[PDB]
Design a protein around this ligand. Structure first.
Ligand SMILES: CC(=O)N[C@@H]1[C@@H](O)[C@H](O)[C@@H](CO)O[C@H]1O
Ligand SMILES: *[C@@H]1O[C@H](CO)[C@@H](O)[C@H](O)[C@H]1NC(C)=O
Ligand SMILES: *[C@@H]1O[C@H](CO)[C@@H](O)[C@H](O)[C@H]1NC(C)=O
Ligand SMILES: *[C@@H]1O[C@H](CO)[C@@H](O)[C@H](O)[C@H]1NC(C)=O
Ligand SMILES: *[C@@H]1O[C@H](CO)[C@@H](O)[C@H](O)[C@H]1NC(C)=O
Ligand SMILES: *[C@@H]1O[C@H](CO)[C@@H](O)[C@H](O)[C@H]1NC(C)=O
Ligand SMILES: *[C@@H]1O[C@H](CO)[C@@H](O)[C@H](O)[C@H]1NC(C)=O
Ligand SMILES: [Mg+2]
Ligand SMILES: [Mg+2]
Ligand SMILES: [Mg+2]
Ligand SMILES: [Mg+2]
Ligand SMILES: [Mg+2]
Ligand SMILES: [Mg+2]
Ligand SMILES: [Zn+2]
Ligand SMILES: [Zn+2]
Ligand SMILES: [Zn+2]
Ligand SMILES: [Zn+2]
Lengths: 430, 441, 445, 443
């Protein structure tokens, strides 16, 4: 029952890694221990310079072979125990007990909380790469759970850990369970408890603030690298890691009306959909304030009728307007002369049948406004047409978080523009 | 089929990779081709959907195994030919011709220029990790080279390429030869030319500007990641990638009188030495203009007498001054009352601890020159906080080159240094010892 | 499931196939843990792959290394370890796994697979007797279950078992390992699995093999001497000696307190010392008989003869009584009164300094000796003028020498007093024949 | 409970006072832990008290013992160990307790108390240089704080410190312990405490001392060779050598791949090898000057002369250039063209296998060598028709004196230039000592 202790989560400026290692060596002087780091930690860890204690540096180096940064190269045992900074080994044979529980149980990961101020708690975790979203909540089948929040020693087989794509990506507490829950693996939170370091790290408030700031930065870089734009929680809390008003939109310029995310087998990033909803809400409010007649058109109306929201793989919003009302709103009249950035940061342009309103100068998620005019009972443009009675009157229809205006009998409207059964038969990307 | 074509250097928004792949498949439909990218290139490359053509996405992903991001997974031949975008296979049998050249010669790499506007040139290259420097120059033994500049097809054994730490780090033209030259590997530039693409990529000024801005940023991030702080060409045209007046110094706060770079088995970063030289030159200029008697002290005098410069693993500069001259310098007068940032950004501070003066390069970069005031008492210069020495060593002072300018030293500075440090200290440098530092701490 | 560390100990720095050995295992598993152990840093350089799963363990002391750096167990983190000799290669995949599976399913603590060299391993029996400084090898009665192996094999066992041995990696391992495992009652199961030989084997020339076998023979002799194995025997009767001879010093040096140093080490007289004592006793008896000197077995030599016709197994000399008036009959004896004498066969004869007796040493360098004690009859009682402070040195009736009787001793027939049971009990006490004890029980019994 | 274990390692089996030593400590505290350590069972018997707190530790492999039995840590259950030499005696009670209090309150990893023998312990300075294979001793400038002790002392330190060393009990302990502790930067504090001498001291006769010193000198010589200490010096002088010489082979033997064995050991050239190189260079230069052969420092020899007036400390040979027209002046050189020549002082002169140069070896057995490279002017440029880059002739018109290896040698004029033509700009100012990590990557 040989188990390698692997230490990955610690701060170079303030840690208790020397105590952690010394505590395990007191139980077994030949205990295999691997401390992993991206760069050489300074101030020096001053680990014992003995063969069974090794420092694994995970970044590329001009003077090292490929194997030097591959962590499975440092681990020869069957099992590996991820130990966070702040833990120490007090009683003996706790790793042995964790191995017995693993072999006895049915979960590929077992875990023992560390008696810190934040001991690990069970969590449910639901990962959707298609929607760039990870959803956390309370674990129904605790102590069997999908993920952990807080400090714990996690033990699993080395073949399972090191076949993951990013086994030691920081923060491990986020990166590991995103990967294991995606594979359908479970973590069993055992009744065992590891003691806290007798001289804990981050004792001052300034040190904790510094470490929390670095940790938030690593977590944001981790999720952006792995394609999680949104972390949502049971209870409603949202964590965003995508585009915003001051950034580019996530996918950039589209070619052949097929954005980049479709080729990646994903749908629209949720940050982009959120920006489209807020631009739709804003533009609708401006048009209504100015007394401009608008209705939902195209895929926006289709999504409204289907689920009251933007079709989750679409990337813009379409609205029809009465051409004779264009002069009622200041932004459209200005858009005739040139680009208009109003006081809320939205960009109105004509560019030349329709109008386009972009979320901001940097974020080019947009709503298109298509003017129509009644020639003799039929609404028509100049660069397909439909009868005007579909607009007399307009009906309230929920869309993107607010009540929009839609053509009356819009299911019939949508089936003239798209064909029979379009609401019930979404054209899923493949 | 013994060679796998590997394409790493291209841009997603403007490339000729489809023509490249097609040109090799026209010569052999079974030719193994691998296009490597960090993320899925957009717009779609639309490569042929055949077994011998594979798109390798090297970034880790939540739904992929570890092997998916390791490039050797995608190659099953003995050799790899790194082909840059803009090349095209025209004459058949060029890859087999490069293989026979490789086996018959003594170079680990062989290369063939691509007939673009920037065809590959033979270069010399020495990599010094201790000095954080990559020194380029004209190749003395061309067409045997240490590195190439320009477009070339580079062929080498897959075993050699994928044994490197960063085999496909971008730009390849930079990272590959930094790694192979450090290992003492040569590349032989053959008398073989690959044709250019018939529709070349980046054919407009705007497209090239986008590509060069992105390639410049990738090169800067690569050299910082790999610890190359200075790149030179024939000892000149310096390119810096380290600290400066507006940043922190490279190694930050020193613990246990041992800076971080010693634990990394290197010497002082050259950007840090450059800033130390500039600060010593500036402080000396100020002290001389104000009429302050100074002399090189400690390891600065030792370095000056040894080779006329800072000891390349030291991280500060020491000067002795006459205490009765302190009042002549505005900055030193101001330093007694508090921290002073002078008109050129240097920070002058009075050490309340050891009673010396410290001049820092800038408010953010704490590379410093220390000033040690001495006063005579019965012919011996002495201090009040802590070795004292006879004053006759200062009567008179002598000129001594140091750090690119002529500094002042005690007369008989060899005897002076020997009394301070011991006999033979000038001829026996205390070279850094990683093995010993690993044992002592 | 099973993690196994390959450990390489048996190779020569001047000529080896260790690079091919390690690379062959790395081709089956790139992360395969491999430990090469050496006493000093091999030059020319081994040039192993400088990857973290391949490590070199130097078993020398060094001023800049902790104690753990030379203890090989700190390099092995796996449950199992496989000793692999130079000249072997990993060809078939998963052989270490099959060896682990056979270990767990069997009852032996060691399992082994031969290597397809010109000398593949063979099953051997072995009992070790430290007290008699002897290791006895024979044919395996219950093959494929053995006490030892002869030849090249991969040997797999638990790290906890290997590194709790006193000298796990002492060279040659093929000798050292099984001396330690057989003494502990452990068995090695010889499996029907075969490792391939290296494609470019080491020691390809006759001259390279010649300097390798001489270096190995030097290491084996040093090993057995360090571990106290004086004699190795094989079925068929072949003997290898590693102790005394005519041309060296005796094994144990000067004796204080009647108790030689090996008895405190809980061992008996080394078998080489006993052999020399028998040869010297046989020779001296022939000289005295040819010279017409009446002699009889005395002291511990007579007691050992009466018990089992041989030297007492912990005794260290041989004692004979002779008639004083016969001394002039022997040329060596007459010369000994004038000084030290080295005779026709290299034996050294001297008149001692202590107490009026003669001593015959095996050689000038080897001081195993026969002591000749001259007696003369006063009036029916044998006596002498100077006495040693032993309870065994007394007068005795001359009728015990009239006549002398034959008695086997040390491989030949010797002359003994008649009624030697009563003779021995008079000088040693009742029941001495039936109650063996060490020379002086007050210090060691 | 006791906190110190007395450990005895330095004694002779044939003549010791270890029984008196043990008894004296047991008289102060009958439970006092005592360990006597030895490579083999001491004979004659020590006859130590048969009590659980007195144990004989045998540091030898044995067929019938576990690995723990030969590890001294196994025998010590206390925090501290007191290494006590033979000839010491415990009289004043509680001396071990004072040493513990002294160690805890001070800043030295070791503390020590002299034994009142004829050779009390003295405070010494000690610099250990593994790269130079040298142990340099001297007077201790900051006594009572020392790097090493010479003489008899009880030395106390933590068990975990002592047994963490590679060779904690290697003999002589007086040498091996401080070589290990001084290299680590540990200090020993010589306390103002004195242990008494044994009432019946060991080795009381001149003959017994002579045998003990002979065995101890043999142990020291084997210890220093095993640990890679080739040179011991006192105050820079009184040299004591433990390496190669005129009668032996050179330390590193045959060089493969132009990378001598000491580089892989992460050390520089052994000082015995450097000493023989300086002697051979001085001899050869003396021969060539007396015979009228014009020579000059070449290659790395000239570089070492210009940098610090000596051989570069990681080089292993010496290179000189000569005028080919002058080779007939020297008898040794003229005989070297016919074959190998062993001159009157044991030096071996040979003409190169291939390469057309001369080689002078220190002796028939020691192959440390000086190479002579003959050039000849071809219209103002020096050239050898065999290939040492060709250079113009005016650098030898004239030659200049340059200190090298303890004597004055000839160098090309403007040798700073000369070196930069052959090695590159700034070569004198930029020495790069061996990089073992780069060697581990390069091969
Ligand atoms: C080769 C040899 O000597 N083997 C012996 C065997 O003869 C004997 O039966 C057994 C038990 O005494 O001990 C062993
Ligand atoms: C043992 O010595 C090594 C130095 O070689 C050091 O790293 C380690 O911490 C030491 N251990 C103890 C317990 O002193
Ligand atoms: C994950 O999916 C299940 C259905 O498979 C759903 O019931 C559950 O609520 C999801 N988890 C979270 C945290 O939303
Ligand atoms: C992945 O799993 C396989 C099978 O369990 C194993 O052979 C391989 O070593 C693993 N990869 C690692 C540990 O990197
Ligand atoms: C990879 O490079 C290392 C040098 O760090 C070398 O030791 C090793 O042999 C190389 N492996 C291969 C397969 O070339
Ligand atoms: C000796 O065996 C024990 C178990 O019996 C084990 O815990 C220990 O690690 C072993 N020692 C060595 C040096 O392998
Ligand atoms: C030891 O080294 C120091 C500093 O290098 C030096 O001052 C001292 O003289 C040296 N002592 C000896 C005995 O060599
Ligand atoms: Mg702390
Ligand atoms: Mg659109
Ligand atoms: Mg300083
Ligand atoms: Mg007898
Ligand atoms: Mg006797
Ligand atoms: Mg040479
Ligand atoms: Zn977005
Ligand atoms: Zn810098
Ligand atoms: Zn013997
Ligand atoms: Zn030498």
């Amino acid at each position: 029952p040989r188990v390698t202790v692997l230490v990955r989560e610690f701060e170079a400026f303030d840690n208790a890694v020397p105590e952690l290692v010394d505590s395990f060596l007191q139980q077994d002087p030949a205990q295999p221990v691997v401390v992993a780091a991206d760069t050489l930690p300074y101030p020096p860890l001053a680990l014992p310079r003995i063969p069974n204690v090794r420092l694994a540096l995970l970044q590329p180096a001009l003077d090292r072979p490929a194997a030097a940064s591959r962590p499975e190269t440092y681990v020869a045992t069957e099992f590996v125990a991820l130990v966070p900074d702040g833990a120490r080994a007090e009683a003996p044979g706790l790793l042995e007990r964790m191995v017995e529980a693993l072999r006895a149980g049915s979960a590929r990961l077992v875990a023992a909380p560390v008696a810190t101020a934040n001991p690990a708690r069970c969590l449910a975790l639901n990962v959707s790469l298609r929607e760039w979203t990870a959803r956390y909540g309370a674990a129904p089948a605790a102590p069997r759970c999908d993920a952990l929040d807080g400090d714990a020693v996690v033990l699993l087989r080395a073949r399972d850990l090191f076949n993951l794509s990013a086994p030691l990506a920081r923060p491990v507490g986020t990166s590991l369970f995103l990967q294991t829950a995606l594979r359908g693996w479970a973590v069993q939170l055992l009744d065992l408890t590891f003691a806290a370091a007798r001289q804990p790290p981050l004792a001052t408030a300034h040190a904790r603030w510094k470490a929390e700031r670095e940790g938030r930065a690593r977590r944001a870089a981790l999720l952006r690298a792995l394609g999680i734009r949104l972390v949502s929680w049971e209870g409603g809390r949202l964590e965003w890691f995508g585009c915003n008003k001051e950034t580019t939109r996530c996918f950039g310029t589209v070619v052949g009306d097929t954005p980049a995310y479709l080729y990646e087998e994903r749908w629209t990033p949720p940050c982009c959909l959120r920006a489209l909803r807020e631009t739709a809400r804003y533009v609708v409010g401006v048009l209504e304030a100015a007394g401009v007649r608008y209705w939902l058109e195209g895929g926006s109306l289709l999504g409204a009728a289907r689920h009251g929201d933007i079709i989750p793989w679409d990337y813009d919003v379409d609205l029809g307007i009465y051409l004779e009302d264009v002069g009622n709103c200041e932004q459209l009249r200005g858009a005739e002369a040139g680009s208009v950035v109003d006081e809320r940061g939205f960009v109105w342009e004509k560019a030349g049948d329709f109008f386009r309103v972009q979320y901001s100068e940097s974020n080019h998620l947009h709503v298109d406004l298509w003017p129509f005019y009644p020639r003799n009972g039929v609404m028509t443009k100049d660069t397909v047409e439909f009868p005007e009675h579909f607009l007399q009157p307009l009906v309230p229809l929920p869309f993107a978080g607010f009540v929009a205006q839609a053509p009356n009998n819009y299911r019939r409207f949508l089936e003239l523009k798209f064909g029979p059964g379009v609401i019930e038969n979404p054209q899923y990307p493949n």
